[PDB]
Amino acid sequence: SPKTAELKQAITNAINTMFFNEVMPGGALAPSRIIRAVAGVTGLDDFEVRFPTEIQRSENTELLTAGTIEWL
Amino acid sequence: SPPTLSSLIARTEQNIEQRLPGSWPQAREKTLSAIAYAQAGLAAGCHEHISWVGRQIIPSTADEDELLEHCRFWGVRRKQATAASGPLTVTTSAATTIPAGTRWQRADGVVYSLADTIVIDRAGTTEITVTALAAGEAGNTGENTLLTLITPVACVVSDAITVKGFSGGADIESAAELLSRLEYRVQYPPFGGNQFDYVRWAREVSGVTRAWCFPTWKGGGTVGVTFVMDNRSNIFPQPADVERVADYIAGHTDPITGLIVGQPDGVNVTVFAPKAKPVNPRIYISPKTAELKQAITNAINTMFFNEVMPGGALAPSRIIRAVAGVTGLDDFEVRFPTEIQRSENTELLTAGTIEW
Amino acid sequence: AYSPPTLSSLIARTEQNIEQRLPGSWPQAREKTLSAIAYAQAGLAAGCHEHISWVGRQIIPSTADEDELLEHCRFWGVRRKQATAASGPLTVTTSAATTIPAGTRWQRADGVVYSLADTIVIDRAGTTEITVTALAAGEAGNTGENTLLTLITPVACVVSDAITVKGFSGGADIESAAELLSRLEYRVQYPPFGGNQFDYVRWAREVSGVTRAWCFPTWKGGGTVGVTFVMDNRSNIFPQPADVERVADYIAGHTDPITGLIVGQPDGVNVTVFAPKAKPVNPRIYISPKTAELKQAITNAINTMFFNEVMPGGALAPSRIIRAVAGVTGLDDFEVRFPTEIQRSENTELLTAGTIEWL
């Protein structure tokens, strides 16, 4: 809801560290973890995660990585 | 922001080198280095005392005694502790008069004295009221606390059993609570019937925890204050509580100056309790456990206590933050509260029954 | 921190600091040239520690020196009170009924000048009492009983003599530190006084002269309140339109005498100040022993009862008048004849005792 540079940077860093912590090759990612990471910012008013509503999966040789986040 | 010990050492050594040309005080185990370190230590001591002299200017960072002095100067008054009173059931043999001063002692040693003389002729067990002497939180006791008599009295049996427990004991407020009261006083300045003044007036009375004031409630001359209570079970107000809060706002005496202050005569307040507006959320959690149920209920309740007021709106993102704050669970999808909820000022939203 | 280190401890620790960082070990008895430097450094440290302690004693206003307390008062808004003069009566006699100029001066033997700042014309040769205020600010200009004063500049048909049967009073010097601290704490701790039915009474009564006040809330419906004030010190008990305007102005705005901030009526409500209207009642009491003293006592008792138990919009039973008459106890037989019904009135009319007959 607030579109400011420091909020975008904080959300990006939160997502990056959430990927760093509990993302390993051959793992499963749900929208729950991303929503939790975004909510744990204490600098927002309203938000909603829309795209990765489905469970993301990959094999052993593949590793999940956060790409380019749109709108922020 | 005092200078560090290394900075003081470097400054002193630089000064020594500047004042004595061709000198290098930083040499190991030398007289100039020893003198520089001694002076750095003395300067660090002075700086630490400067830091202690500071940090007492504001009561927020002040020590205990200076905080008490600041409270005394600003007018906040400590409230003394209370005694413990209770009903004592005493058995009697014949007609007798119990004088004011008789003492009954518990098994521990705490004594309770009668403050007014009484006369009895029933030749059976009667009930009196008795107050303690310690005047502290140890005064109050349990349900049935057998206790004996210290001062012998004619025609009365020494032992006595109390069926209703002693209550009313308390303790003097701590410096933390005094600081909280002083901080509230400084942060919300007092006017004559201001929008913050009505809130603080409705909060000054016992029981009330939170209160809000809507200026120009129904017209150009009426203002409306609504209060809630949480220390209870109904967590809401009753007509008697509303009437007594309105009476307190209408008139009460100021402890400081001894005069009476309150709402202005011309305006009307018309206190009214809020009306519950439950909201039922649908939340799915893959692990099921009563501990997780209690944790999520507590999280939502604390969310509502923190960010919900009468006349305010609640976005679903607040519920999603409360649901994501729980550590144990793995999935926290919500289904029901997709849209925003709003209510009029007379009704306050409440987290109703939680659907899982 | 609190309890800064003693000079002995500073000396010992500085000497140890110099001794430890050197290769050798000093003997038990010696007079080294580093010991003097250590003692000097310790003295410097003890001096600054004392300076810092004095600075730290100046934060709270309860322990500050007089200068720092004055700085605190300057910040808050409390102003110190200067020394006040002393005033009193001068009994001077004139020969041919002259006019005393505006700034005549008297002198005391000690050498303190008194002055009269007013003009007074004398009608006939006799002793007159005039208010005179001293020209010395301090307490020294404060005489006692029967002190004699003399003129400085001769005035025609005025004998240079002043008796001062009642001594001069006044003569207060500057305020003390404790008094100033108490005034500052009053200013800090006093609460705001929003317009209340009790507060209007005080605001009306604070004006000099006004002695009784009454407040009627919700007069003529909600949103406007009425007040009434009466001054019995003057010969005419009821006030005048000028006094009504003055009291209304004081109600609208004034500076609080105890707190430097500005107080006044609420902006919303409408305050109306009206002078009460007399509705006299004539007792016409019959008394068996007829003399001046008994008439005076009965009139005084009636006036006292009226002053105590009579308010605008109130009823007055004749039983109160009967009791007031009976309380004199200097009579033999008395009778009340005119007031036989329960007297009553509205808000704007105030009961008062009229001209009493037969006494």
């Binding site: - | 300067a43 400084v186 202005p264 | 003097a36 500005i262």
Partner: protein, 150 residues
């Protein structure tokens, strides 16, 4: 410098010690005493810091204790922050128009509370030559304010 002179005076007095203004004892004494001079200046600073009207380092604590950051505190000017803190710390008064004009003058503005035009409760504020929000926050509970600029 007086601090070097005080240090020199603290030294023993005799024919041996040379305290002339060009000697090595004085040259060393100046460098030794400069640190305590700076510390004593820092300690003297606590006199001014005592008030929020002139504090510099403790402005953060003075604002945190007062709950200062709000509409009447201006953007970044340290003088404006000091004035806002020193005005809120000693903030008590009634609802009288006179007090409201005095308050609006205390913040640097100058307004006149004139009579109503359309009703009774509504009161008109004439601003001649932050204020809007400050007055809407500290306004009387029952009354309503209208604003006219000149």
């Amino acid at each position: 410098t007086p601090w070097q002179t005080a240090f020199l005076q603290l030294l023993p007095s005799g024919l041996a010690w040379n305290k002339s203004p060009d000697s090595k004892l004085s040259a060393l004494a100046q460098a030794i005493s400069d640190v305590i001079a700076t510390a004593a200046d820092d300690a003297r600073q606590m006199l001014r810091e005592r008030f929020p009207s002139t504090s510099r380092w403790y402005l953060g604590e003075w604002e945190s204790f007062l709950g200062l950051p709000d509409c009447t505190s201006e953007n970044g000017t340290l003088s404006e922050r000091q004035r806002a803190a020193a005005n809120k710390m000693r903030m008590t008064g009634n609802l009288s128009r006179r007090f409201y004009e005095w308050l609006a003058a205390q913040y640097g503005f100058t307004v006149r509370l004139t009579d109503s035009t359309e009703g009774q409760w509504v009161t008109q504020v004439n601003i001649y030559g932050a204020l809007e929000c400050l007055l809407e926050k500290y306004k009387p509970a029952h009354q309503i304010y209208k604003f006219v600029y000149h």
